[PDB]
Amino acid sequence: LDVKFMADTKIADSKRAFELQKSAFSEEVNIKTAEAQLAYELQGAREQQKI
Amino acid sequence: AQRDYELKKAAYDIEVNTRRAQADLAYQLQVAKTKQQIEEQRVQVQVVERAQQ
Structure with missing residues (x-):
């Protein structure tokens, strides 16, 4: 048991x-995933401006 | 011999739990930062819309 522990x-x-x-x-993957x-919204909202 | 092992386990578990908690919540923080940029432009359309009205 001594060797086991x-x-x-x-x-x-x-x-x-x-771990x-x-x-x-x-963290890195999660960050760039968001x-x-x-x-698409950051660009979408920006394009609605000209539209 | 059990105690000697148990204490290191708990000690390492502090760090593992700490790092896991960080990684777990790391997603929503960026979602907030990204939305912060998006909302600015969503209402910027209102300014341009009103200017043409």
């Missing part, structure tokens, strides 16, 4: 690095 800690430290980086990357969705 130590093994579980190293698995957790590996988990930690991964942390997922979050960092998801822009991609709403750009």
